[PDB]
Short mmCIF file of C-alpha atoms in Angstrom, two decimals:
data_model
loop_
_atom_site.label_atom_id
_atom_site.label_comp_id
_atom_site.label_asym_id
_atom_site.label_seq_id
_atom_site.Cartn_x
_atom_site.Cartn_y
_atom_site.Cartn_z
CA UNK D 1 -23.01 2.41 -7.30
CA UNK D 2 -21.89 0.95 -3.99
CA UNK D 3 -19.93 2.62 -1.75
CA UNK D 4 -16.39 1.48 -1.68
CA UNK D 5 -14.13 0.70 1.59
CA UNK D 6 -10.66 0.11 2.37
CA UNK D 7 -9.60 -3.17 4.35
CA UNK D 8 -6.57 -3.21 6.13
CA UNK D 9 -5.31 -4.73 8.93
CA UNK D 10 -4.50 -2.67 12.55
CA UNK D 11 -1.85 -4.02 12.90
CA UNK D 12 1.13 -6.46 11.32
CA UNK D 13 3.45 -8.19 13.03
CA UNK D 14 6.92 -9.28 11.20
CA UNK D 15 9.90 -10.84 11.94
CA UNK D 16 13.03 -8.50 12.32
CA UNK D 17 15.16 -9.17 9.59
CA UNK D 18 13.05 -11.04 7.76
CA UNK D 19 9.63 -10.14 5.04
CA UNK D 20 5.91 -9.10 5.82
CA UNK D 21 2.88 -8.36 3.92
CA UNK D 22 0.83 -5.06 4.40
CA UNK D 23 -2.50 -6.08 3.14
CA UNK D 24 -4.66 -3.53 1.56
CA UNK D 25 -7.87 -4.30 -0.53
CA UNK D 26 -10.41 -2.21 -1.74
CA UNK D 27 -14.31 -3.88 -0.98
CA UNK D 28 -16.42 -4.33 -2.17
CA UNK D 29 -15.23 -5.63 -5.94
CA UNK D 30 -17.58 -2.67 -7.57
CA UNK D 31 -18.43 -3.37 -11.42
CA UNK D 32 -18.08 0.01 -13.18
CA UNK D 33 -14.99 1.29 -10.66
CA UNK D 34 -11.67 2.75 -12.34
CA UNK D 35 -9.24 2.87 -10.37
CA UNK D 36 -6.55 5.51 -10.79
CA UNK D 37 -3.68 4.96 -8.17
CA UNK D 38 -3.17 3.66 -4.84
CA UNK D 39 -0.12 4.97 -2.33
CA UNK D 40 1.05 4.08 0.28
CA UNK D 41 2.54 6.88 2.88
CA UNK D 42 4.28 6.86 6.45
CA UNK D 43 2.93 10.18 7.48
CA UNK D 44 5.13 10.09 10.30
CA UNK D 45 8.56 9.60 8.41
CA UNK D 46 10.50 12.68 7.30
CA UNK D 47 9.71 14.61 4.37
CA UNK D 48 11.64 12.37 1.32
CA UNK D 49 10.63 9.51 3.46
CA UNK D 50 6.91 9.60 3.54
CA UNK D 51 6.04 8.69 -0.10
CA UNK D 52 7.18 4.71 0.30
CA UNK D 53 4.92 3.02 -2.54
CA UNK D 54 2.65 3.76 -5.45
CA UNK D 55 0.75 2.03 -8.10
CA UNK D 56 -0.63 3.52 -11.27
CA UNK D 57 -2.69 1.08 -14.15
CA UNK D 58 -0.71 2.08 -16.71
CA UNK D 59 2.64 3.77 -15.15
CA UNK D 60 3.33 1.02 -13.19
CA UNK D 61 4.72 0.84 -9.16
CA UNK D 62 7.57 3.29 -8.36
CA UNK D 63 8.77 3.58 -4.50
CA UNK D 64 10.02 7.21 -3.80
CA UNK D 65 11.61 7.01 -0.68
CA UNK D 66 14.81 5.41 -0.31
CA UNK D 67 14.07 3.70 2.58
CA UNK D 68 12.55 1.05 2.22
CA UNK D 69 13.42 1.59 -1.30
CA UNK D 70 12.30 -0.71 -3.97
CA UNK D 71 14.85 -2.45 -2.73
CA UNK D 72 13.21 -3.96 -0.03
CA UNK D 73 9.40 -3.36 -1.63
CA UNK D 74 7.07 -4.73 -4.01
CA UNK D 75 3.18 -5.24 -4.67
CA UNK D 76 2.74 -8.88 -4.54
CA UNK D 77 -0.46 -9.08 -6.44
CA UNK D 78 -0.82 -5.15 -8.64
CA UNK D 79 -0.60 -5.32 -12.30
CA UNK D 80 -0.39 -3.08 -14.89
CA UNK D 81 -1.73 -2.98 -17.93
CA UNK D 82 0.94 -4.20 -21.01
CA UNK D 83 -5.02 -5.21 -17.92
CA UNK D 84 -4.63 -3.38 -14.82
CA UNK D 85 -5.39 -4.80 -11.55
CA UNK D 86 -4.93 -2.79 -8.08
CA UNK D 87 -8.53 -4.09 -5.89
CA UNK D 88 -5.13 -5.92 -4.25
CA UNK D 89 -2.51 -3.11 -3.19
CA UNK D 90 -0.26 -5.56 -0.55
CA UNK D 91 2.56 -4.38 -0.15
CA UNK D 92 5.65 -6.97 0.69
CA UNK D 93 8.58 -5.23 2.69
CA UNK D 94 11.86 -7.33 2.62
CA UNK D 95 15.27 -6.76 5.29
CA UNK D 96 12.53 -5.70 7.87
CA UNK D 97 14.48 -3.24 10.92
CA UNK D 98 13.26 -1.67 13.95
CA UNK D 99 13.47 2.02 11.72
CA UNK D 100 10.49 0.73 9.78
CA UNK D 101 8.22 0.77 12.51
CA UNK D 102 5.06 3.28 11.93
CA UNK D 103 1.87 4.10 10.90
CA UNK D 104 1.23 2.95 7.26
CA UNK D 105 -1.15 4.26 4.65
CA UNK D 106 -2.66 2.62 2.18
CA UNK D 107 -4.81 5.05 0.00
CA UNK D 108 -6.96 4.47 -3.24
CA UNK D 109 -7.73 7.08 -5.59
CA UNK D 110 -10.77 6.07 -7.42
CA UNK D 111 -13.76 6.96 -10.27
CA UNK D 112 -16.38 8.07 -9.42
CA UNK D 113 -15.46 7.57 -5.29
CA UNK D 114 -12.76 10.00 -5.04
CA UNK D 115 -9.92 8.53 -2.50
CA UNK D 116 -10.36 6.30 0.42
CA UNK D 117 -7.74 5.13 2.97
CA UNK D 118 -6.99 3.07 6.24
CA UNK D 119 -4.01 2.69 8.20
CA UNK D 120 -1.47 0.20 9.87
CA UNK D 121 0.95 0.07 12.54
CA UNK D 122 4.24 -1.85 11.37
CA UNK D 123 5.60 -3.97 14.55
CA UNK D 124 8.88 -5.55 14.78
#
């Protein structure tokens, strides 16, 4: 089986105040692939800020952190299964302020691949 990848982009620009997208796909679309979860982490924020997004196929998203918060975040395109779909992990982040600057990861765990991640930097 292929490897697998993870495209992001080095950096997104939003609008202060206003929404972006973090885009996050996993390549290449891999017949046979399960995926289990995909996060995504600011391993810069403080410790109960750090976990700001997650995806599971059957679980569902849940956002940790209170900042963002699901609040202010949602997958635009992850579904779960009620099939599951998470190739697409983007991220929308509403309300956007100068504190959410950072590095972002977006990280896929994956059978039989294991995990695979890239990062973004978050400008305002």
């Amino acid at each position: 089986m292929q490897d697998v990848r993870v495209q992001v982009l080095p950096e997104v620009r939003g609008q202060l105040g206003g929404t972006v997208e973090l885009p996050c796909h996993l390549l290449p679309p891999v017949p046979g692939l399960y995926i289990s979860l995909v996060t995504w982490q600011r391993p810069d924020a403080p410790a109960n800020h750090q976990n700001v997004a997650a995806f599971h196929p059957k679980s569902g998203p849940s956002f940790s952190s209170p900042k963002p918060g699901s609040e202010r975040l949602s997958f635009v395109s992850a579904k779960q299964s009620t099939e599951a779909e998470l190739q697409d992990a983007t991220l929308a982040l509403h309300g956007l302020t100068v504190e959410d600057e950072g590095n972002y990861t977006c990280e896929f765990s994956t059978s039989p691949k294991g995990s695979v991640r890239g990062m973004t930097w978050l400008r305002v």
